[PDB]
Short mmCIF file of C-alpha atoms and ligand atoms in Angstrom, two decimals:
data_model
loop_
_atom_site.label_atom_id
_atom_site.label_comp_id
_atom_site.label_asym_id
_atom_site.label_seq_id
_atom_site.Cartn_x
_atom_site.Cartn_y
_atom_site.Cartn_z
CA UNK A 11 43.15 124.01 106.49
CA UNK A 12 43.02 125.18 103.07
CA UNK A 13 44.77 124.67 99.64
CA UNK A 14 47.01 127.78 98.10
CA UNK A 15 46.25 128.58 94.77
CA UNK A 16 48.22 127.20 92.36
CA UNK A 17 48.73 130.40 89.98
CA UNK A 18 48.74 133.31 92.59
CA UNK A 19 49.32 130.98 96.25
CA UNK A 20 46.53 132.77 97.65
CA UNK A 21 43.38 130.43 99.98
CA UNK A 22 41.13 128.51 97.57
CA UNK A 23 37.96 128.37 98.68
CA UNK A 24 36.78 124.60 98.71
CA UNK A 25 32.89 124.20 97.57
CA UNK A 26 32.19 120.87 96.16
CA UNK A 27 33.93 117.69 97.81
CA UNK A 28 33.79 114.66 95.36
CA UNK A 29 35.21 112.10 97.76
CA UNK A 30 37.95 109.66 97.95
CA UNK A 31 38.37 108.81 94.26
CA UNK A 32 40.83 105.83 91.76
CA UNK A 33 42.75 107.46 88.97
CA UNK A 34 39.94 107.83 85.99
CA UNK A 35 42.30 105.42 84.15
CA UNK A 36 44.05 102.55 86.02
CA UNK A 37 41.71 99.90 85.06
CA UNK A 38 42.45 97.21 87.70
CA UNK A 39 43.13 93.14 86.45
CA UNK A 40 41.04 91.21 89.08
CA UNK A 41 45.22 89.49 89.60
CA UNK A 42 46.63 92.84 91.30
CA UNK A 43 43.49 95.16 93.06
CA UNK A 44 45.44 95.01 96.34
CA UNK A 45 47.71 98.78 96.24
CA UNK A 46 44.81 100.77 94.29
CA UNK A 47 45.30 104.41 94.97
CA UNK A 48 43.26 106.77 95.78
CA UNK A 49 43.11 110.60 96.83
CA UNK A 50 40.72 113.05 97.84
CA UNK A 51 38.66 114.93 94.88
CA UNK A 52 37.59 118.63 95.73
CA UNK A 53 37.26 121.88 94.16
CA UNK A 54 37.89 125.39 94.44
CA UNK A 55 37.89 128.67 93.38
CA UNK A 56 40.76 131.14 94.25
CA UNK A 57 40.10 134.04 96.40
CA UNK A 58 42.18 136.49 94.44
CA UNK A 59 42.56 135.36 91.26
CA UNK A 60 39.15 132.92 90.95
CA UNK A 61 40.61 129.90 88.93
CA UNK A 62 38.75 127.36 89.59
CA UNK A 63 40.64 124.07 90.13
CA UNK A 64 41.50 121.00 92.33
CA UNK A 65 42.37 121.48 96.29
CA UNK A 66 44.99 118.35 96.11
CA UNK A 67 47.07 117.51 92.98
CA UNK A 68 47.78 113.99 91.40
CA UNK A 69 51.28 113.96 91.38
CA UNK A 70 52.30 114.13 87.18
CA UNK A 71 53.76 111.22 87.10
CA UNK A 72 51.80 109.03 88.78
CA UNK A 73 49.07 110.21 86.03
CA UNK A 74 51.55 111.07 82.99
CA UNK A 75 54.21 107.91 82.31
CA UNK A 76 55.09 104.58 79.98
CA UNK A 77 51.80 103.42 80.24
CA UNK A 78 49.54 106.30 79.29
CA UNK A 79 46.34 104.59 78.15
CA UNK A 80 44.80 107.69 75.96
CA UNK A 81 45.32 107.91 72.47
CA UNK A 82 43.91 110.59 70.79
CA UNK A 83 43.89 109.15 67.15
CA UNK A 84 41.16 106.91 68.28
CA UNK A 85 38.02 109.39 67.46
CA UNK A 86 37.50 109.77 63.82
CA UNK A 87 35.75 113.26 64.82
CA UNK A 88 38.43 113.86 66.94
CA UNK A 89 41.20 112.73 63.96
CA UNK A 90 38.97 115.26 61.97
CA UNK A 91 38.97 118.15 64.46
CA UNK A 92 42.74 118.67 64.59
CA UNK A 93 42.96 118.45 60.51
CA UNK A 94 40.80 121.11 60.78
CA UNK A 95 43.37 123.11 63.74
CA UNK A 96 46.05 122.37 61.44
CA UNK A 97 44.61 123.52 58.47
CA UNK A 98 43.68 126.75 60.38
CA UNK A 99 47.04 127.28 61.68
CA UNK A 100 48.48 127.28 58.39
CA UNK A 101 46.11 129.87 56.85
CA UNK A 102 46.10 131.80 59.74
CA UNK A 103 49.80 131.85 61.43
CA UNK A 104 51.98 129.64 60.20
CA UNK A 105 51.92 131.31 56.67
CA UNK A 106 56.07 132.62 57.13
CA UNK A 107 58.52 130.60 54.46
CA UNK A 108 59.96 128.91 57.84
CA UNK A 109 57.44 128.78 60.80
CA UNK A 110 57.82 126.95 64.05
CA UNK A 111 54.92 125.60 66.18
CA UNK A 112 55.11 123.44 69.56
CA UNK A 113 52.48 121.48 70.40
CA UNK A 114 52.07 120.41 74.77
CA UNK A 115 50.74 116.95 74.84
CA UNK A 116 50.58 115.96 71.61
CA UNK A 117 49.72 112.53 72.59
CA UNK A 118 49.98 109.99 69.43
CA UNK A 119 50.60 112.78 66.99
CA UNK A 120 47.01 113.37 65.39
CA UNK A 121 47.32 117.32 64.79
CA UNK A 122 51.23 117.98 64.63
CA UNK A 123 51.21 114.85 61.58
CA UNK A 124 49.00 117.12 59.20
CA UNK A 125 52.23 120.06 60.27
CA UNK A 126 54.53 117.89 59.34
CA UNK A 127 52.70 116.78 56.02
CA UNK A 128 52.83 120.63 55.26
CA UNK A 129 56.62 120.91 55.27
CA UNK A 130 56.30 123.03 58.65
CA UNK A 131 59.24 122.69 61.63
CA UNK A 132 57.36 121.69 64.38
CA UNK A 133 58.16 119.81 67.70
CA UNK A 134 55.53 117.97 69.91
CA UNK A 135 56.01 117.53 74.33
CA UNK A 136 54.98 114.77 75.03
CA UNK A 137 56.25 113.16 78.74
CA UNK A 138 53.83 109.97 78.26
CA UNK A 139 57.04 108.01 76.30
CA UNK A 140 54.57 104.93 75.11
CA UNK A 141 52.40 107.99 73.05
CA UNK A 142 55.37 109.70 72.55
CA UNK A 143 56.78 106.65 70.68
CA UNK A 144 53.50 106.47 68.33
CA UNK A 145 54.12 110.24 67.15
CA UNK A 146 57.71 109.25 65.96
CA UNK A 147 56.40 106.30 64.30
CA UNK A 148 53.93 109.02 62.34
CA UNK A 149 57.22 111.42 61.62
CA UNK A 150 56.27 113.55 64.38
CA UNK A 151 59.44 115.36 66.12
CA UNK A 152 58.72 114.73 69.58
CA UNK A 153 60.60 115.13 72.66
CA UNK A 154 59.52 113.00 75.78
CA UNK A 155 59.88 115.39 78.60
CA UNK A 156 57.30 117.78 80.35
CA UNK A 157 56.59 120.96 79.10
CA UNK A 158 57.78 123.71 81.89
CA UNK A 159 60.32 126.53 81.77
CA UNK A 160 63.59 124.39 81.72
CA UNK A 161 62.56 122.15 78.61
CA UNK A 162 61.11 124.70 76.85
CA UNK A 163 63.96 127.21 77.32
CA UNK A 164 66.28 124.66 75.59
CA UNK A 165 64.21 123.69 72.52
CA UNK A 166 64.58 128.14 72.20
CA UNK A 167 68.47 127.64 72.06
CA UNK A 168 68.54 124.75 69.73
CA UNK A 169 65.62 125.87 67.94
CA UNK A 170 64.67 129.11 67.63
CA UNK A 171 61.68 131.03 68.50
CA UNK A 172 58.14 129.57 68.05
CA UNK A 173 54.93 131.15 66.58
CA UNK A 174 52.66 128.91 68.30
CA UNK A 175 52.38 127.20 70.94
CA UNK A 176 49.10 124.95 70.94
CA UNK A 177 47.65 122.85 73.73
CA UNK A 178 44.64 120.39 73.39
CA UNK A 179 43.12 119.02 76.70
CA UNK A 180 46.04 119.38 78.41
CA UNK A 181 46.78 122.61 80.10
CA UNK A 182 44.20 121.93 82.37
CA UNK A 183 46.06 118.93 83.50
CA UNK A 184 49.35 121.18 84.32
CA UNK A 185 48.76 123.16 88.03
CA UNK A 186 52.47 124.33 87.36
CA UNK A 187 51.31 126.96 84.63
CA UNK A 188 53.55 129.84 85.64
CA UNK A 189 56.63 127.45 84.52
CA UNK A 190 54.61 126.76 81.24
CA UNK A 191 53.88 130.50 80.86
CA UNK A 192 57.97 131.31 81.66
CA UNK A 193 58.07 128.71 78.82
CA UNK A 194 55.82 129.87 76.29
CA UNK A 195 57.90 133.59 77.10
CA UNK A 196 61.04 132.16 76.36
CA UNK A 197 60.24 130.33 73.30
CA UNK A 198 57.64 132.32 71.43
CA UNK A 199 58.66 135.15 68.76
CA UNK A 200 57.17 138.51 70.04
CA UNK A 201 54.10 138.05 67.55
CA UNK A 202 53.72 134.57 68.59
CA UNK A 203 50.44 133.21 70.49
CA UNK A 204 49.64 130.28 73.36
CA UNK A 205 46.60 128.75 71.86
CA UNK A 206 44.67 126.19 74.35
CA UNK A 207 41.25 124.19 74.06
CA UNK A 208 40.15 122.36 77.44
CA UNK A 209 36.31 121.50 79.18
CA UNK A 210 34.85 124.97 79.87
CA UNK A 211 33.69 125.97 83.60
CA UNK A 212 30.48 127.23 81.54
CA UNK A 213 29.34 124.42 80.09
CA UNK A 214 30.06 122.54 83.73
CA UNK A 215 27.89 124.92 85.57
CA UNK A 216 25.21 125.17 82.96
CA UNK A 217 25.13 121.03 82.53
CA UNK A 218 25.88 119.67 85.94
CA UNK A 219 28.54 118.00 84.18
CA UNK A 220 30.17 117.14 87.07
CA UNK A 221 31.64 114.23 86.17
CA UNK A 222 34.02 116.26 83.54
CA UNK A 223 36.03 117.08 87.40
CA UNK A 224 38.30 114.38 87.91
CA UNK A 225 42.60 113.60 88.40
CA UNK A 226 43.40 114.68 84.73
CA UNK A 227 41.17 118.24 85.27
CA UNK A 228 43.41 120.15 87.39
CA UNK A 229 41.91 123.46 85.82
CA UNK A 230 38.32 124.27 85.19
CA UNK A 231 39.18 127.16 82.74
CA UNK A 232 36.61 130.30 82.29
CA UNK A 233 37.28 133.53 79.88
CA UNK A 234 37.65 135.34 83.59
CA UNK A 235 40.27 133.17 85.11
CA UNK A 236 42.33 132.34 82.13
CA UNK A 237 42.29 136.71 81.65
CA UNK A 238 44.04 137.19 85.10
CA UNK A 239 46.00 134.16 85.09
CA UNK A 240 47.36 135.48 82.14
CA UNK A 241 47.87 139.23 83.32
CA UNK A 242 49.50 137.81 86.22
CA UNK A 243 52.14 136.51 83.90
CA UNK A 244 52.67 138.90 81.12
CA UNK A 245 50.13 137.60 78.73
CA UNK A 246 46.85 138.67 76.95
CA UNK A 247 43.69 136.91 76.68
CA UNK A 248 43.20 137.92 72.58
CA UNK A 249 41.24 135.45 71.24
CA UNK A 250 38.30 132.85 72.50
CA UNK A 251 36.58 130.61 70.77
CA UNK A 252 33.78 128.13 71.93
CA UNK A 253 33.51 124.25 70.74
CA UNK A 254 31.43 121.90 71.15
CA UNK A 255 33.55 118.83 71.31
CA UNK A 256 34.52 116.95 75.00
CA UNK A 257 31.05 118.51 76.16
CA UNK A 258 31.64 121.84 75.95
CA UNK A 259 35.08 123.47 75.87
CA UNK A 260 36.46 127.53 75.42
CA UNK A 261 40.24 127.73 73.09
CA UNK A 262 41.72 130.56 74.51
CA UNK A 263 44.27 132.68 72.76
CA UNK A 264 46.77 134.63 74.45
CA UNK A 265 49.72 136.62 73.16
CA UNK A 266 52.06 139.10 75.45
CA UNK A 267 50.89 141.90 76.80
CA UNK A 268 50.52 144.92 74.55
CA UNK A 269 51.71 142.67 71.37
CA UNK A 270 47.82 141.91 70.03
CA UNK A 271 44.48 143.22 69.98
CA UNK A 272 41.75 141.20 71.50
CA UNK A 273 39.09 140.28 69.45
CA UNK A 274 35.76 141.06 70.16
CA UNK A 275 34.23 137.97 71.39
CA UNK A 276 36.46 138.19 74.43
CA UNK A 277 34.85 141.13 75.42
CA UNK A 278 31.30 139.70 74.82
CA UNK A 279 32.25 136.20 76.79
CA UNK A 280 33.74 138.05 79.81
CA UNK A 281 30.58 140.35 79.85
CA UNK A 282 28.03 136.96 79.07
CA UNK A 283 30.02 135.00 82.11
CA UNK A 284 30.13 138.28 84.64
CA UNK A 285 26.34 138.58 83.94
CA UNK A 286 25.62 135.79 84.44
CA UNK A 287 27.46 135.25 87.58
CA UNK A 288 30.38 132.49 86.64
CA UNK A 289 33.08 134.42 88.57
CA UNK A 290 30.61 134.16 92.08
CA UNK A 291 31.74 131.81 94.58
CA UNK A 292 27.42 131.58 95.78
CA UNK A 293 27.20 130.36 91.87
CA UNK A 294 29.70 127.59 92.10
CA UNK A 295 27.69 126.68 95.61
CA UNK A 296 24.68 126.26 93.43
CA UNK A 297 26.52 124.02 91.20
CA UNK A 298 27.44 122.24 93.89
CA UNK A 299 24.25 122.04 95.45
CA UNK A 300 22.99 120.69 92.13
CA UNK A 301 25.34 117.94 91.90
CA UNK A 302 24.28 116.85 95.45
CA UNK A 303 20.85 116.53 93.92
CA UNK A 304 21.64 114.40 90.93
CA UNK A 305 23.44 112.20 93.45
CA UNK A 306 20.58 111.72 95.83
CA UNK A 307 18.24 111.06 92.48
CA UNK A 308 20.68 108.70 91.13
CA UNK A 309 20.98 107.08 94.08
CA UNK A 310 17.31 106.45 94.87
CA UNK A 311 16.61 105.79 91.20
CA UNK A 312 18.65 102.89 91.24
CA UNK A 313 18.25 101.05 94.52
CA UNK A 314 14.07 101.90 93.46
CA UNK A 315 15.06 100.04 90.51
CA UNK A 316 17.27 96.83 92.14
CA UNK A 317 14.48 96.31 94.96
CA UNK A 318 11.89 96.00 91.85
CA UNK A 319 14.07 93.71 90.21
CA UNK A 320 14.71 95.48 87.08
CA UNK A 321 18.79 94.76 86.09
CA UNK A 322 20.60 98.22 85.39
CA UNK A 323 23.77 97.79 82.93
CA UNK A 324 26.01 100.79 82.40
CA UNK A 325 26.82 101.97 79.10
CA UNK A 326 30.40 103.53 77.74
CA UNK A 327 33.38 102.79 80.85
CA UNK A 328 34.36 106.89 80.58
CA UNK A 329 37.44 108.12 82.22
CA UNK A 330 34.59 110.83 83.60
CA UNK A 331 32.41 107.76 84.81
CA UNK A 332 35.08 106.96 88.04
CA UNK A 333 33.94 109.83 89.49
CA UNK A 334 30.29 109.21 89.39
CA UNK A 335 30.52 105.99 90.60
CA UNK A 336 32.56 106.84 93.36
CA UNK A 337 30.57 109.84 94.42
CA UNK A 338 27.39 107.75 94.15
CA UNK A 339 28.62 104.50 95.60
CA UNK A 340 27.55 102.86 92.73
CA UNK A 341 29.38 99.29 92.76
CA UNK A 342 28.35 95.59 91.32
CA UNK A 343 25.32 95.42 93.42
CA UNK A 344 23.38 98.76 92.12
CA UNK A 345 24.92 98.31 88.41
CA UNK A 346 26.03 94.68 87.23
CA UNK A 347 28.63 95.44 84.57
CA UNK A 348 29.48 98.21 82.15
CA UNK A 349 29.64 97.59 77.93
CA UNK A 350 32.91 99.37 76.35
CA UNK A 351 34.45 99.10 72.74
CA UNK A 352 38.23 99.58 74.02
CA UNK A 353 39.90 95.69 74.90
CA UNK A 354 43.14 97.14 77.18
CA UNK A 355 39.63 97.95 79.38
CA UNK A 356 37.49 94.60 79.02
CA UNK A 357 38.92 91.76 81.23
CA UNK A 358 39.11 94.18 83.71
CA UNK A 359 37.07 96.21 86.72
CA UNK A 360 36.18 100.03 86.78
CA UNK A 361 38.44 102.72 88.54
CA UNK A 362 37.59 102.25 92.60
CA UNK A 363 34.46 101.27 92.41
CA UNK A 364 35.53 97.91 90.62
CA UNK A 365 32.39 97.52 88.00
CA UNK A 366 32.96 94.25 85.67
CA UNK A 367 33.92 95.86 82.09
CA UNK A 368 32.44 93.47 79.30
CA UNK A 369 32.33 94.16 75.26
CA UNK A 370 29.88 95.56 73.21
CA UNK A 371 28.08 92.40 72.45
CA UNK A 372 26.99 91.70 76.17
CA UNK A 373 24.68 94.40 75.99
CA UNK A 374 21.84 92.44 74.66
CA UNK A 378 18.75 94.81 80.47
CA UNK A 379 15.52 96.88 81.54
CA UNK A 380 17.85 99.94 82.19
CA UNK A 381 21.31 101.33 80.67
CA UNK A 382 23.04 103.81 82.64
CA UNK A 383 24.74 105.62 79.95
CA UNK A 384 28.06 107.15 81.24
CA UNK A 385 28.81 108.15 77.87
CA UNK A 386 26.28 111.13 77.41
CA UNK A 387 28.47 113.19 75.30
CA UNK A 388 27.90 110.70 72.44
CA UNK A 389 24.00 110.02 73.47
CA UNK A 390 22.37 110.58 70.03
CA UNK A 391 25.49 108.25 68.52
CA UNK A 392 24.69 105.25 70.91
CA UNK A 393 20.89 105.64 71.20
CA UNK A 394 20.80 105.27 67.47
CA UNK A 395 23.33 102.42 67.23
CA UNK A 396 20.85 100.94 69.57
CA UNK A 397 17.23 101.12 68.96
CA UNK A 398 16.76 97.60 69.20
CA UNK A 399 17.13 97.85 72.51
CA UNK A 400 15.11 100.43 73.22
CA UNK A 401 12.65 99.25 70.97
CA UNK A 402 12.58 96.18 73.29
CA UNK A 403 10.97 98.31 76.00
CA UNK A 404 14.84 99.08 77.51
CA UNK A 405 15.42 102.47 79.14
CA UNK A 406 18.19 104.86 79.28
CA UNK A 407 18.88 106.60 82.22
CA UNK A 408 21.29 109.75 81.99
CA UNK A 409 22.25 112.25 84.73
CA UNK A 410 23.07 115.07 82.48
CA UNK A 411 22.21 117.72 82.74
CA UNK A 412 19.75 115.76 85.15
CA UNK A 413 18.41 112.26 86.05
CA UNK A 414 15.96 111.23 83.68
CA UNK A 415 14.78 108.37 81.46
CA UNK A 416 14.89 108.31 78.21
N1 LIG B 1 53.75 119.32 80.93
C1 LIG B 1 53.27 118.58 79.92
N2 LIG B 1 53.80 118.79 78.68
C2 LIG B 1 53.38 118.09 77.61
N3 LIG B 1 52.45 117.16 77.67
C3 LIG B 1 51.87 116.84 78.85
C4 LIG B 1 52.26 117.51 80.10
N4 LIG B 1 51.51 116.95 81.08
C5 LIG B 1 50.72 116.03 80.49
N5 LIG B 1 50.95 115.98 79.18
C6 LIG B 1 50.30 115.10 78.19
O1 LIG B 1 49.03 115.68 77.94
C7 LIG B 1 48.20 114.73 77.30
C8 LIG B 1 46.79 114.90 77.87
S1 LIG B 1 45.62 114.00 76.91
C9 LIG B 1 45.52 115.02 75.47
C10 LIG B 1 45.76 114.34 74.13
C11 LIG B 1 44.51 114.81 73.33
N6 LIG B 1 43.86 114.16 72.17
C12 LIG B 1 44.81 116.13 72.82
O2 LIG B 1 43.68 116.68 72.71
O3 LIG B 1 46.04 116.55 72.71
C13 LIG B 1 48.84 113.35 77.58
O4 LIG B 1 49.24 112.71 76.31
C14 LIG B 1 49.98 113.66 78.56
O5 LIG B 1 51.14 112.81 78.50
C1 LIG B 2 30.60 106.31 71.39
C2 LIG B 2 30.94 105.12 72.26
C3 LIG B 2 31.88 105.24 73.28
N1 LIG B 2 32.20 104.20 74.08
C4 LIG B 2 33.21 104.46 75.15
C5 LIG B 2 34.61 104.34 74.59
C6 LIG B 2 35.41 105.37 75.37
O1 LIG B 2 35.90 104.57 76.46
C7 LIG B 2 34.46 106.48 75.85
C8 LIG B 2 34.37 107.88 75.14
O2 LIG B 2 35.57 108.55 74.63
P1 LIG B 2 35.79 110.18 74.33
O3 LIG B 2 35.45 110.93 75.61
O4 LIG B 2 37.23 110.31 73.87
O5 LIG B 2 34.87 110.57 73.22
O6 LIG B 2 33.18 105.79 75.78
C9 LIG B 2 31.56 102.93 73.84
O7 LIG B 2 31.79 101.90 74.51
N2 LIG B 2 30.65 102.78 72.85
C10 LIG B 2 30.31 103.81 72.05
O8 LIG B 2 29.47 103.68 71.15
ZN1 LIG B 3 44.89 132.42 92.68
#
């Protein structure tokens, strides 16, 4: 029987079932593996309201705790990119003599720091207390707790009202967002706006990207969805914006009903994703349909390649990757080990489907599987030598091919 909706409690309508899947981040030591955990990953669309999002929830904690393992500050482009948000919040709305932004999931402290450098109050949620810790460190003002109705209520009383409330890849990891919405009402002035960037349903659809759907990615957000959610809850979808970073993502703007003027790019993207069918439920079945296919290519490609005796390595141990490998049954046996640059994951074994992580160095195999296709160019660069060698990439988005 089917999941309610999270925003509206209405049936969701369940049309791509991703299996029995790890957390995207519990790295296992080859001393514990016994208690892994698993749950079942599906999605859905909403009958009524059409958000798109998971039919069972990782409970928060299990996922959000002292031993958080993502920290933001490592990407350069990514330390960059939220100079640049910070920047453009304080030419564009944080320009009073006293302004106020909160930041949900502020994570080690890489945009609220460059807020802080500009003399600006701010205050960062941040419920992952290891993280949490780092942005203090920085001279972040951070409060470890969850961002919902309650918490954010209270930082209004002590306070005072905020003009901004921003939120990078992480309100699509919140399926309670009628408490953060009930927060954003009680603690934003009446001009103020609830500015979010997360993965875009578009750029899924469009890519296959399939492997972007995991525990983390509650919410696949479109222009349509995020509208009505937001209608649903006394907001306005004003603004919308389109970037390129995580492999494709939308930062939505929304301000209360009545209180702003959207622009007129939100007009144009609702029009662009009702033409071209986003909001369908037969659409998302194609999707789905599509992913089946790069499964059953994957799959052949690589026991095609193991019964030839060609060795297939794997290439960047992504938080995304635990789903393909456990949708594909890809284990030791199809794919020997997989190279990554990040230590707390060498010495260790992949999410579920228990792939050897080794460093860099071991790389140099007649194919790399490169889980890491959102940095392709980067690595295929860094790496000529190999495929100058006569090596082989094989990638699976936005399709299986060589490379
Ligand atoms: N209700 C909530 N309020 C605030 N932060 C939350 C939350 N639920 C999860 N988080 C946090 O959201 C973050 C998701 S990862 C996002 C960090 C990233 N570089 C960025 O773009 O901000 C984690 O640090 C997690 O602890
Ligand atoms: C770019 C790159 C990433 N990786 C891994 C590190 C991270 O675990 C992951 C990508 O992180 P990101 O999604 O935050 O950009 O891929 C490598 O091992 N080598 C590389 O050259
Ligand atoms: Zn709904």
């Amino acid at each position: 029987a089917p999941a309610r909706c999270r925003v509206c409690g209405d049936t969701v309508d369940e049309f791509l079932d991703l299996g029995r899947q790890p957390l995207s981040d519990r790295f296992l030591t080859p001393a514990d593996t016994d208690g892994e955990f698993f749950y079942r990953l599906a999605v859905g669309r909403c009958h009524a309201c059409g958000m798109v999002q998971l039919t069972e929830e990782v409970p928060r904690h299990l996922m959000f705790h002292e031993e958080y393992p993502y920290h933001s500050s490592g990407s350069s482009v990514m330390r960059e990119h939220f100079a640049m948000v910070a920047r453009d919040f304080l030419a564009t709305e944080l320009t009073g003599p006293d302004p106020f932004v909160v930041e949900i999931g502020c994570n080690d402290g890489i945009m609220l720091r460059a807020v802080h450098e500009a003399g600006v109050r701010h205050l960062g949620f941040e419920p992952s207390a290891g993280v949490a810790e780092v942005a203090r460190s920085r001279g972040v003002r951070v409060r470890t707790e969850f961002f919902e109705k309650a918490t954010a209520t209270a930082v209004r009383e002590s306070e005072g009202p905020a003009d901004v409330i921003y939120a990078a890849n992480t309100m699509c990891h919140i399926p309670y967002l009628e408490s953060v919405f009930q927060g954003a009402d009680a603690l934003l002035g009446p001009d103020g706006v609830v500015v979010f960037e997360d993965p875009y349903l578009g750029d899924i659809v469009a890519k296959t990207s399939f492997d972007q759907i995991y525990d983390e990615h509650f919410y696949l957000f479109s222009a349509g969805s995020v509208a009505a959610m937001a209608e649903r809850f006394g907001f306005e979808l004003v603004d919308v914006e389109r970037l390129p970073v995580h492999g494709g993502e939308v930062r939505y703007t929304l301000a209360r009903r009545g209180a702003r003027t959207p622009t007129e790019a939100v007009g144009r993207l609702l029009a662009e994703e009702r033409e071209q069918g986003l909001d369908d439920l037969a659409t998302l079945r194609t999707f789905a349909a599509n992913v089946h296919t790069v499964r059953d290519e994957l799959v052949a490609l690589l026991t095609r390649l193991r019964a030839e005796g060609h060795r297939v390595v794997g290439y960047g141990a992504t938080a995304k990757s635990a789903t393909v490998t456990n949708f594909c049954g890809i284990g030791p046996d199809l794919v020997s080990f997989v190279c990554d640059t990040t230590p707390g994951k060498q010495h260790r074994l992949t999410p579920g489907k228990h792939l050897p992580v080794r460093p860099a160095e071991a790389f140099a195999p007649d194919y790399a599987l490169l889980f890491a296709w959102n940095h392709a160019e980067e690595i295929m660069a860094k790496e000529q030598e190999f495929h100058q060698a006569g090596g082989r990439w094989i990638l699976y988005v936005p399709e299986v091919h060589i490379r």
